[PDB]
Amino acid sequence: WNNIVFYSLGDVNSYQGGNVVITQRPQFITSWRPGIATVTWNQCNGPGFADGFWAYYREYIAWVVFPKKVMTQNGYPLFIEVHNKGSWSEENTGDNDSYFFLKGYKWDERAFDAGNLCQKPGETTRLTEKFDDIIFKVALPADLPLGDYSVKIPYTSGMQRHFASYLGARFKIPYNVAKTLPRENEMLFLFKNIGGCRPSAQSLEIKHGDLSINSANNHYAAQTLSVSCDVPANIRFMLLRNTTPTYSHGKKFSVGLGHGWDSIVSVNGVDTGETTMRWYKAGTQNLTIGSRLYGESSKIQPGVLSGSATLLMILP
Amino acid sequence: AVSLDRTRAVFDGSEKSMTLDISNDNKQLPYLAQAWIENENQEKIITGPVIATPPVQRLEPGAKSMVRLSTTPDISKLPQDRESLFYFNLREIPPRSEKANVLQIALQTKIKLFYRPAAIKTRPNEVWQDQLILNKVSGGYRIENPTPYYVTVIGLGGSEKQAEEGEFETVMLSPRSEQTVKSANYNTPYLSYINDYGGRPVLSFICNGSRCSVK
Amino acid sequence: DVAFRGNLLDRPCHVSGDSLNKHVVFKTRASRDFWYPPGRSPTESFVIRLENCHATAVGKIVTLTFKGTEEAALPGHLKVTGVNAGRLGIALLDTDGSSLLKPGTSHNKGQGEKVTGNSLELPFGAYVVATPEALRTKSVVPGDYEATATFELTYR
Amino acid sequence: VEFNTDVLDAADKKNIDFTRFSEAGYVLPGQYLLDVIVNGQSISPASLQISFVEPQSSGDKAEKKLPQACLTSDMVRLMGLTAESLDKVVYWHDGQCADFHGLPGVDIRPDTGAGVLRINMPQARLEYSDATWLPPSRWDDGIPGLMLDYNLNGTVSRNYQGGDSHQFSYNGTVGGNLGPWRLRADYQGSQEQSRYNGEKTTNRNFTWSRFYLFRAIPRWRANLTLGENNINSDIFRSWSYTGASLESDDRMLPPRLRGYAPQITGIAETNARVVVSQQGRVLYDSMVPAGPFSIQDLDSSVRGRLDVEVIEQNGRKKTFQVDTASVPYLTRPGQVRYKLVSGRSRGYGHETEGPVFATGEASWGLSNQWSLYGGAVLAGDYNALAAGAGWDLGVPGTLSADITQSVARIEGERTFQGKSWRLSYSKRFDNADADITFAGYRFSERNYMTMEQYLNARYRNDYSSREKEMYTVTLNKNVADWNTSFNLQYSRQTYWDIRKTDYYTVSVNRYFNVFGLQGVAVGLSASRSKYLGRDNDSAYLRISVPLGTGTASYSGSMSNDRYVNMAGYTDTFNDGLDSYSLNAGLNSGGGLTSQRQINAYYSHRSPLANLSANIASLQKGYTSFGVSASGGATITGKDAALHASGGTRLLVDTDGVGGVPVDGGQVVTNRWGTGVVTDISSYYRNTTSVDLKRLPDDVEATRSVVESALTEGAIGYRKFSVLKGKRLFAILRLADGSQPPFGASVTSEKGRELGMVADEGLAWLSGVTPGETLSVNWDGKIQCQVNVPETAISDQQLLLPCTPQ
């Protein structure tokens, strides 16, 4: 006869992932912890009790089921994959949702004890087994917004016991009932996304001259801001209004600089206020923040013009 | 002929060199503008406190050029609790024509260079002329300057048609001082002035008989 | 990233655009017109253009005064600087055409200043005259003579 | 033309020269302050000294010449010139006018009128040096010092077995920069404790994950790495090792040169004006040289049609479209990319050893838009030669292929010879926007053996999971006015002694809006893994609705008969630094249980360190409240500091001021007078300026922008002349009642200059705290002391007494 009783761990471990970039992949340690554990899958085909007077063979194999893809709290896949699998034996890698790790540490020994060979689902036993470590790098996807994340990965990691009665017995749990196991063990990990997109200047000073009023009625001042990426995202930036505009110039994004002097902002030549750019690979691009100083209804009042127009880059 | 965008150049004590651009409105014959900086009693002090960096410079017809004013230890050898006055003037030399018995005219300009120390450096829209007061004299008026900056009055009047359009001689004001000015008595005299920037705002004075200022 | 836009600005107190090549000439002889009693050439009317940003007045914006070298033999005149060194002088008249003003006095404001729109035209008259010590003795010679007068526009 | 200088210039002649400028249009030699422009950009933002003097070097009979810009050795050192290859500026002394006659095509037109000094030079005479990239001769390397980067997340827990709450994470990254040699050691562990009624278990695991040294090399433009790291999944998979690694970097290379794009070739007639637009934006607009030309400097991000247009001097036109490939191994025509790596193979333990190897993997492209890429892996018991080329055919797409003849001599007397080949394909921009981003086909054998299979076969006896075939097609499709990102892909891998594994993953990023603002995103996906009998139909759904002040999210997922839904409310606060979410969920799994998840967080990006708290609870696991701290320090600098890192950090030094705000990550300083900005990239132009509007009223910043370019993992020095205090005039009254002469340097006890006296006690002292004693120093020695009261406010002329000692 061949009896199998699954006994799953109850460890809830945490780790702060830090502040990473989209192209950077953070590495983490998922340790094996010999703590409190609970039965999740019970079977009885042979006897139900034992007094230790019959011959019965023993084997103990570790069972680690880790997920490949995992959804976020906003619904994004995180392709978690192995660089080094440790001293385990990764098999059945043809599945799409989960890896299957194994370790044969106890596979041939004869016991002489009085025990319960098939425990009920309301049962707790002792587990003290130091195992090898395992490691993973979170390969982040292409599109991921800014902010903080609270991703939880579903994992069933727990020592099962195989009860048998003959010498040379080899039996593992079938993978579909091993992958249809309950969502017991969680992992509390947080990681901050600083975003793959960033500008290079971080402040824009446009050197425009000490000019006369005739050229102040229509002037052009240009400055180029270089945004450099290594991810194929599709950025979007909003020219946020910060100070008070004076003259209602219609559809054109007027930035009143003060003392009766407005000035529109011309991103890439046209007065759109927002543009649309697609990026396909690693590189950089240029955006000309042009400025036209026609903020005059022929009631001229000269003063120091020092307004502001902050552009914030939001990942859609 | 050359043209100047500044009606009074202001030189703040923070930066050691301001820019001052000139242009060439002529499109037929060139010119060479040479500049120097005088003082209150109007003399060409060649190696004074402030110096124009190009001493003589050729100007193409239709071109433009800048005259920067560098800094020496003698501007530190000036008072810091008040401002300082300087007279920036410049001449133009036209080319010698081939025609005989020709009389030449040089349409030149002299501008007021206002040195402002870094100790009394002002904000971009801080109108210090709001603090100005005017006292009544039996036969005229006297304006007072409590502010440490050089200000200039150009006209006084009761209504908007006679201050800057009447027959009135202007006067220059000095810091922490006063002077008398003969004018007709107005109940609400609005202060018509010219700032360091170049604009000409107007502001009202509401009094109690003898001394007045702003709201 | 904050992209604040800060500047400085001014307004062009300057000359107008109608009369750029202003050089007055004199088609008068020296051996005949300066050997008899009165020694004067005909007056040549020339104007001074002014396109400022405020045409409200004249003395409240521009204090016009003129300088240059003064004639030694003739008080109230300018040096000619040519073949007739000290023998001839430069006269100058105002907008009224009769006030023979001095080399260094300011222009008398309030009269003869027609504000043609936003401009300010100042007509002046100047004719070359001879010094009486060279006129009566008839020591003047015909030739080329180039004089230059400087007009400072010291603003307010 | 001769001028009228004969009348007057002034009262007297200034005796300089008066005819030379008139005929020669000559500039007067003096002290000018010009901006120097080299090929359209600027080598300095606020360039101070440009001297003009008259060259008396060349003797002649006429001796009438023009002056030129007397550039010294420091500004031609920072001009970006390649003085190493052209030593025509090395030998130049500051006494004579610096001629550039030894170089061809160099014209210097000094136009002092516009205030610019334009210098036009050919591209091969100088380095790259644009507006955002400092040249490699000027790299601000690191100062000596160490660094600590902590990541700790402690939390409590609640289970169904009794009572249990004790948990402490332990992550970290230490290291020390010693000149260009940079040490890095990342430690990660955990600390958990369990307290049940009848049992009290605890454990303490802590292990150094990686030990490595890396020194950046500018000459070779590649970073060596000594110590431990990994080899990426390039041809062979991920395999850990310890040793040396001369990897060709790409961040040391300019950002418009990264990746692949072909050089535009052709010889039409003259100095034409090139214009190349990708989607309505010019990527390159300049004047090519006369005759033959080839643009090696354009290697930017382009994945499709690009109408590279040439416009000549007369006005003639020619149009031709060229094609890019974007395959992972073809590079720039003329330059190489390589990986020279060697050492010992790391197993899983920290002290694990193994064989010694010497693997060289390089990629080089000839200039007929073709490229070969080779790999030569050789160890004492295992060799693997990899070679193959990749080339873009243009209009039918692009190809790439390689051969891999690996020989594996195991100790069981079984020599394993395997020749495995794989092919790569991609596709350009179609008119109806069809884009195949990657298309592989991996033909392997029964005897293929890479490095990771040989590592598992040498000491661990693993003999499974080798790929027979692996081929995927990945098309991607975008569409205007619909805004849906369609991307279907299907792969079918086959292992040894295991059957086929067909994959099917489709996705769509819908973008439209109904009763909300534009920016609402809808995500849908469908996954299907096909075995011989089963088909795992998985489907994840995404709904994201932003409203400016709010960003609600909804995520539905289904692994295997488990419909799991979640609804989120993640949003920032009014300042941008903080962010908080509140999210619930439902977990209805196949195992007869319905669970309810609840997750929330509250972050606070403080300038001293990042901090956050998280509420997380589900069914059978409850109320896990935690605190996550993540910050770092930099000791052995000027003074120590605390910050918000994964590499380089710039150290901004503002002495005397406690709370000045710096840009980048809005990092404020400390009581010691220092701060460290962390959101900077390596090798770029870093303009770290203080936010001039949010300064405190007691302090003032004179000059705010300083420039340098830091190396990868370097710490850079930037001094900041700032001042804290009031604006005063101390009218002194000595014991005899006198006033000392000029040069009386009023100095604080910390060693900072405050000002000097002009004539009678009108000394403008700046930056003084109320309640201190200063040191007025004339004749190079201390003579008297003063005493400032607390009562002193700004803009005063207070009666200050000077008590002597």
Numbering used by the authors:
A (entry chain G): 21 to 336
B (entry chain D): 1 to 215
C (entry chain K): 23 to 178
D (entry chain C): 1 to 644, 648 to 808
What does the paper say about this structure?
To generate a two-subunit intermediate, we replaced the PapK NTE with the NTE from PapF (PapKF-NTE) and deleted papE and papF, resulting in a ∆EF P pilus tip fiber composed only of PapK bound to PapG. For the two-subunit ∆EF dataset, starting with over one million particles, after 2D and 3D classifications, we derived two 3D maps, named Conformers II and III, at 3.8 Å and 7.2 Å, respectively. In the ∆EF cryo-EM structures (Conformers II and III), the PapF subunit is not present and instead PapK is directly engaged in DSE (by its engineered PapF NTE) with the pilin domain of PapG. The lectin domain of PapG in Conformers II and III has not yet fully transited through the usher channel and the PapG pilin domain is still located on the periplasmic side of the usher. In Conformers II and III, the PapC plug domain, NTD, and CTDs are resolved in the 3D maps and reside on the periplasmic side of the β-barrel channel. In the Conformer II ∆EF structure, the usher NTD is bound to the N-terminal end of the first lobe of PapD, as in Conformer I, but here CTD2 of the PapC usher is visible. CTD2 is bound to PapD in a never-before-seen binding site at the vertex of the boomerang, where CTD2 primarily interacts with the C-terminal end of the first lobe of PapD. Due to this binding and stabilization of CTD2, we propose that Conformer II follows Conformer I in the chaperone–subunit recruitment and handover cycle that takes place on the periplasmic domains of the usher. The interactions between PapC CTD2 and PapD are more complicated: in Conformer II, F732 and W767 of CTD2 interact hydrophobically with A119 and I120 of PapD, respectively; in Conformer III, F732 and W767 of CTD2 form hydrophobic interactions with I46, I51, and P73 of PapD. (4) Next, the handover of PapDF from the NTD to the CTDs is initiated by binding of CTD2 to the midpoint of the PapD chaperone (Conformer II).
